[PDB]
Amino acid sequence: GSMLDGPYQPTTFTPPSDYWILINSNTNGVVYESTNNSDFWTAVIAVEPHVDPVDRQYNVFGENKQFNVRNDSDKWKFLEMFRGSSQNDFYNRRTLTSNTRLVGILKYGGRIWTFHGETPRATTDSSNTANLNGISITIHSEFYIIPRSQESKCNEYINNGL
Ligand SMILES: CC(=O)N[C@@H]1[C@@H](O[C@@H]2O[C@H](CO)[C@H](O)[C@H](O)[C@H]2O[C@@H]2O[C@@H](C)[C@@H](O)[C@@H](O)[C@@H]2O)[C@H](O)[C@@H](CO)O[C@H]1O
């Protein structure tokens, strides 16, 4: 393969450990939905530039939800919405403000890692789970696969683009 392997078309799958999934977001709305149905639900919402605070409807994990969103940047903003238990409300856990429209997720070392902050200085952070292998993802845009060992490149792509 290539080190940067893709693009792959939208699908649902169980990500392999130790590869970055790099998603080229092409629109507003749900970029991906990821859960193991027990303790980990993350959905990322894309919010186009210059959106004043507004309540929008999104379907996530087959549930209509209303999220208040805003973006006061020229860049796109990606909202990580999380719940760690089925009955809890989703909350906005992390954001990534980005000119490149690339969003990253990785299973590595018992945890899920994602990029947050603001390009070109976006950085990674981890999220815990007691069922890492059970996490599946439905990705609604094209994506790429890059080994964790080449995170340096992944970071470059997240921060400066393809
Ligand atoms: C110390 C370490 O290995 N950190 C890993 C993370 O990689 C770091 O990511 C931060 C942003 O949050 C910085 O970019 C930092 O430079 C990164 O460390 C560099 O790259 C990593 C992959 C290693 O090669 C390290 O030697 C190098 O300095 C990484 O994001 C997470 C999740 O994969 O694991 C951390 O251990």
Side-chain angles (χ1 to χ4, degrees):
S2 302
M3 243 170 35
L4 182 66
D5 175 31
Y8 295 105
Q9 297 310 306
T11 191
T12 295
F13 66 107
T14 294
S17 268
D18 311 336
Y19 297 85
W20 278 102
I21 307 166
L22 217 208
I23 300 161
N24 194 17
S25 178
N26 65 341
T27 198
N28 60 25
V30 188
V31 182
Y32 71 78
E33 295 165 69
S34 181
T35 188
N36 56 17
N37 296 144
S38 59
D39 75 3
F40 185 98
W41 284 265
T42 301
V44 172
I45 304 312
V47 185
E48 69 272 23
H50 302 292
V51 174
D52 297 319
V54 286
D55 272 16
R56 290 172 170 174
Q57 195 181 241
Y58 305 96
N59 195 89
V60 291
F61 307 103
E63 287 165 68
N64 286 348
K65 294 289 181 183
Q66 290 276 97
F67 304 137
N68 185 270
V69 316
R70 67 183 192 90
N71 183 11
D72 87 299
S73 180
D74 280 359
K75 296 173 178 169
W76 279 74
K77 187 186 192 184
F78 301 89
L79 283 60
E80 257 176 55
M81 307 297 302
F82 184 79
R83 76 187 169 186
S85 187
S86 57
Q87 84 281 18
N88 294 341
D89 290 346
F90 286 91
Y91 74 101
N92 176 29
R93 192 177 180 174
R94 299 186 182 88
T95 63
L96 165 66
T97 300
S98 163
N99 212 49
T100 64
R101 301 174 73 180
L102 292 175
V103 149
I105 178 161
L106 162 70
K107 297 199 176 163
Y108 177 77
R111 301 183 286 206
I112 301 292
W113 294 81
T114 56
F115 284 85
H116 71 324
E118 181 173 337
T119 63
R121 304 279 109 95
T123 59
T124 58
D125 190 34
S126 58
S127 300
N128 271 25
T129 170
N131 184 7
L132 185 71
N133 294 334
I135 292 175
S136 189
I137 194 180
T138 297
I139 303 192
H140 300 113
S141 300
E142 287 190 350
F143 65 96
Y144 303 80
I145 305 293
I146 319 162
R148 187 263 175 181
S149 66
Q150 297 283 343
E151 198 170 284
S152 186
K153 278 282 172 211
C154 190
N155 186 113
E156 162 169 353
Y157 303 137
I158 287 282
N159 282 124
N160 312 96
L162 314 152

